[PDB]
Amino acid sequence: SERACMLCGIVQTTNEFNRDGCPNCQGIFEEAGVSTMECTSPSFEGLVGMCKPTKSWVAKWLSVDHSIAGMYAIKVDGRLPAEVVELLPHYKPRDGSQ
Amino acid sequence: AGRAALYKEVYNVIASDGSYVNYRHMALLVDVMTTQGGLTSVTRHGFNRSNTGALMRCSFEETVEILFEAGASAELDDCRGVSENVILGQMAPIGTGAFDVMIDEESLVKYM
Amino acid sequence: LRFGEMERDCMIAHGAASFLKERLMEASDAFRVHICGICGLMTVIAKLNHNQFECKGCDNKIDIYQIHIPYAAKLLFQELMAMNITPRLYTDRSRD
Amino acid sequence: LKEKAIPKDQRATTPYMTKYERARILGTRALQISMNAPVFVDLEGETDPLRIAMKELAEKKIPLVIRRYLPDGSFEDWSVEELIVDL
Amino acid sequence: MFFIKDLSLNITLHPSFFGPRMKQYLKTKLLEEVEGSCTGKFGYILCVLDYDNIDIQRGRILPTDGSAEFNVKYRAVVFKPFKGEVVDGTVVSCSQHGFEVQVGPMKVFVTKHLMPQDLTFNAGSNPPSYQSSEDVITIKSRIRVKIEGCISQVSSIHAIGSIKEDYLGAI
Amino acid sequence: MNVSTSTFQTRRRRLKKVEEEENAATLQLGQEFQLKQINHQGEEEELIALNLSEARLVIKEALVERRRAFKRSQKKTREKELESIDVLLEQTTGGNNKDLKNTMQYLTNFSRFRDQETVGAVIQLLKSTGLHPFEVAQLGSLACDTADEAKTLIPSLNNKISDDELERILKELSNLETLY
Amino acid sequence: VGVLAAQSIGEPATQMTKVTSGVPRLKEILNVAKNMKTPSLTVY
Amino acid sequence: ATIWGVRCRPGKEKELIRKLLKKKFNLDRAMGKKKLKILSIFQRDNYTGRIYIEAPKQSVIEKFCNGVPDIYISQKLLIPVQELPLLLKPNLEEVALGKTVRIRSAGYKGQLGIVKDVNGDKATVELHSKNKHITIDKHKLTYYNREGGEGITYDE
Amino acid sequence: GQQYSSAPLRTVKEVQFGLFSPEEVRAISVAKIRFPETMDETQTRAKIGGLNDPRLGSIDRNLKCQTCQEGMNECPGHFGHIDLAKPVFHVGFIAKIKKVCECVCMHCGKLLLDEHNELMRQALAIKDSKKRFAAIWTLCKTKMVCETDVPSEDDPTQLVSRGGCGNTQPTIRKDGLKLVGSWPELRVLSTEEILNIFKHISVKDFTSLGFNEVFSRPEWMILTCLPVPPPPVRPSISFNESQRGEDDLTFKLADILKANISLETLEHNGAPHHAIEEAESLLQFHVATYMDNDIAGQPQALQKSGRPVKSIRARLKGKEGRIRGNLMGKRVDFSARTVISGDPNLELDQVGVPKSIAKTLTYPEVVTPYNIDRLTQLVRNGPNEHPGAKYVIRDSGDRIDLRYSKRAGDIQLQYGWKVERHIMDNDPVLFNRQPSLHKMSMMAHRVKVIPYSTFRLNLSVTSPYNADFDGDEMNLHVPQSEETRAELSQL
RNA sequence: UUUCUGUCUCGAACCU
DNA sequence: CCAAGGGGATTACTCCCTAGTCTCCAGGTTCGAGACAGAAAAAAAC
Ligand SMILES: [Mg+2]
Ligand SMILES: [Zn+2]
Ligand SMILES: [Zn+2]
Ligand SMILES: [Zn+2]
């Protein structure tokens, strides 16, 4: 059921992903022309529920301090779409690769 | 004087109930308990702290501790003793293993 | 039946060393143990059917000795080698 | 090394036979006779190997010797014929 | 290499064999056990000397078994090869890899890379032979080889040899 | 494997791994091969060596002694000596043991001395040298003609015998070779 | 000898029924104890 | 940072996180301005049986985790500041046998028995009267069918 | 087992003790163990690589060990080994590790003292290993720094450069299964550093302590490669086929292997250095409870059923333990126990034996011309009546059962054979009363076969036995050899 | 003409 | 001049106090209950 976003790590239930997906990266998915189900992956890990990404040092470590409070996964298996990868040069893989 | 007084105590405690034991048994008891410099107590910490065979020593109270000390200090357990020969299941030099038995090739040939 | 410590003592007093040997080896449990001369360990891969004797780990094929010991003594030694202690058994005297 | 061995002279152990030596010798002769060794004495119908052994010891016709181990490893070498089995 | 050393062996004999002839019996068995044997540790045991004066040490009755263990002391002539000594032998058999040379009770193998340039194989003769510019190696020919390595098996010894230095080969 | 053979040198071989020295010609002998050997009666003497002829001679003395013992027990020029040796060995052993046969052929056909007096004389002359028994056995057994050839034969024996005494022993051996 | 001494000293101990005596005293003797229940001294 | 690791029951860690957040969100929905100060909570699969939580003071985690099963609030420890980049790095992890018989020339005559074994010429019978086994020659026993009646001698 | 071997037959007459090296264990092991599951995977018993690996020993009557091909009767079991991913303290020697650490430098690996101290020379004069180590350690506790030089007796001002590190030596304290060192920057001493310093100890240095270079160096006092017992040391037990329970030791071994594979994965993958610390602590704890279940101030390992797990220390520990319960005193056949009754019509040295007990107990008598007729008669009679035998041992060594052989009379007793004839009258048999308080409580008596269910013994022999016929029971041991009979009759 | 089963482990009660 | 002289301020040892091991006969005989159990994932096949 529940899945994790490959791009930035947000975790929500399958119904929530069908409803709105990633509000943090809905724009990036819309430009890249890829829906959320293909960017999300079933195997994930490191699920931190951030309430204050601006002040939290964990959010700075995981590069999510600029976004809104919620789930963010340190490890999200799979390979993000190449189109999104080129659209995000500063993005680096969250599964330890590269 | 310690050996003499100790024999005197053992004689007293034995003869209190009227039983008589031969002197040489008490003498051996005190002499083993005094063969070292001081009084080797017949205890976990006494005679079994001496330097006999490790397999003999381990059969008394501290088994595994003495075996570890034997492994660390690399003791050559003598096998001249009862408990080690019993552990090995061979004729301990008790009274019958105190010698060997041979064949007179000489006299076996001399008669015939 | 069992041959307790006290009865072992009584036989030790009697002097029947042959009795004790027979009673604690042949009548109880006798195990043949091949050992290597260099190491003196129970590590001999004895193929009596093929008569092929070797203690690998010392490379020898010629200096191998059987002993008769109780299975309890065998398996004490196995526990000691499981517990990082060496039961070593040899063909000589050194102190003399 | 033979130097530990004592020659036939200068032996300090008792010629009088010990009960343990007697018992071992009777047993050893008993195995030998029970397993078809030659018998050194005329047999008057005796059939128990222990009895045959006692008879041979009585006549001092037992071909056996004893190394009498001195506790240092040396030994005194004593023949059954010469060992005075008094008891 | 043909020396005399004092050794000793323990022989296990049965109560059943205690007549006055047990000595001649024990001896036939001694020769049975030592004549023709070989060991890595001591080498090849070729013969036993001074039979009539062998000091037979006295036996040992086993503590519970009836058997008698006699440790027999004796001196004997043994042979054992060492790397680098040069010895002579006879060709016993040929093949494409070289030829085996019989030296005493052992065979010496001369590998192809340690053989002279000018000396090579030739199967036009029956049996195949080896020819050189100044030498002729064949079955019935005596040759001098240097032992380079020894391999000791359970009941055998093997030697590897070479022929390169001066005065070696056909003699 | 089988009943091995014992030895008198009660070395300190307790637990020791493979530490055997190399076996080469440079006097780095094995653990048994000291210059000093133990005796029958606990005595210590030097290792004794012998040439091929002395080896065959002691073998023959042993064999004829065995034949005399066997007879007592049951009582109550390259063409003839070889046959005598052959029939002696056949009468001695059963025949299945070829090992003695092959060795005896190997020794008969390229030994040099044949006489007790000659082999005795050789050993008396080598006694004065006092060199190492294996090495003197080599000088008495293998044939040499020049100092350089001898030294490359036995690189160990380089600064042990000077040239003149080396040549004397060489020509003496060459003269003492028997003409068959 | 030693086992003989052991049995001969232990046999009266089992049938063993002022100063201390009996099995408590024998245990005290063999287990050389610095503390002593009823130490005594006889000065002539 | 302030990061404390708490022992918990192995294998259920995600269920613990999900329950903890649902409690937190319900607490936020019920509570107004003054919310609980829990910066975030997470777990680790391969270091199973353990949770990591950030919060300023221990009383916050106590007042959060009261009533939460399968967490050992008593068992908590400081994570060192130097240890955090390595913890948060992305790249981690015989027909006569058995027959009724009657004995005929012996002291046990007229007695039923059951043949147990036959060693040849001598049959062992357990007596159908006495708690004892007896050997007796099988020829001299009269055998009976499964029920009583006619007695047949040894001719079968 | 029984089979014609070829190595020399002899007895052991020494036991040298020591510790294995990991190289020794690797050399001696026949198989490497890496899979914690023991068997039952894919429904094949031969689980290659796991516990109970068939190369270690035959788990059943398969007739094939595949290391020796000897069958379970004869195969002595062959040791496995497991390279632990990090070195582990050995519980028995942990105090000795502490003592050596107080004795030597933790960096330069040299004894804090040397022959330049008079107290140290006097300590070193002691010949005995144990007392010498005790003196060395009592002298080395006081020093708390690896000094770079000592005053020399030649002049006070001139000092000798004895060498070594300059650092201060820690005070070491015991916390559970680990050593903490305080310099105070307190920290747990890593087993890696302790192993490295032990290996760096010099030869004279540790030989000066109670160690030897071939027997046991302090370096191998720490466990880097655990040897695993073969199946004969860890036999399975079974309700029926459906439920087979493995041994406590097998479960501890599997648990250790799970801890080690987890630690190896944690090493190979990302290494946080605190979870690896936790896994190292767990694996040390598991090895510790495996080898010793009586740690001071630490919880005992509990088995799946909640009782304490049976460790090797426990299997050697007490009276039930192996030394006192299977070696000093053990069990034996050819024996009987039953009630005793008085009997004044019996000779003093005679003892009455029930007919049944005589029928079961046997003496192996060898066939000679001197008893061939009586032995053939006994065999013909067979085991059912008293004068007779049960077994006939031929020359090849195989036993034939006379009760199951119907051609018993047809068997001819060739020579050298044996028969297990029932004990007849006038047979020496030891007679013992179980409270063997003293020497005369075990005496050899002559059998008198006597038809009844109770041992009868002469009344005057009740005093040395301390017997009373008030429900007492006594113990009859039948000798099995001519030596044994001769000893019992003459001694 | 087809045979050498098979156990542990925690206790309880009783006998000498 | 002198000859001690009381500590400075560390050495050196010495001698006394609390917390942790490891028992506590020599044996037999029957008798009984217990080999967690819960839960979820992979595989079977109605
Ligand atoms: Mg009573
Ligand atoms: Zn070995
Ligand atoms: Zn095997
Ligand atoms: Zn230092």
Side-chain angles (χ1 to χ4, degrees), chain A residues 6 38-39 41 76-82 84-86 91-93 95 97:
Chain A
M6 181 56 188
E38 301 105 299
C39 85
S41 86
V76 294
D77 313 328
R79 175 32 150 171
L80 201 72
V84 166
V85 184
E86 321 316 338
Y91 154 71
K92 304 312 211 63
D95 43 358
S97 86

Side-chain angles (χ1 to χ4, degrees), chain I residues 13 21 31-32 50 84 94 157 167 181 205 210 233 241 334 358 376 395 397 429 436 438 446 454 458 484 486 490:
Chain I
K13 44 192 182 143
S21 196
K32 184 92 191 303
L84 271 43
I94 277 174
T157 51
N167 44 7
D205 264 348
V233 185
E241 291 106 349
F334 294 130
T376 51
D395 53 38
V429 295
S436 306
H438 82 247
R446 264 181 311 91
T454 291
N458 174 277
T484 312
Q490 302 334 290

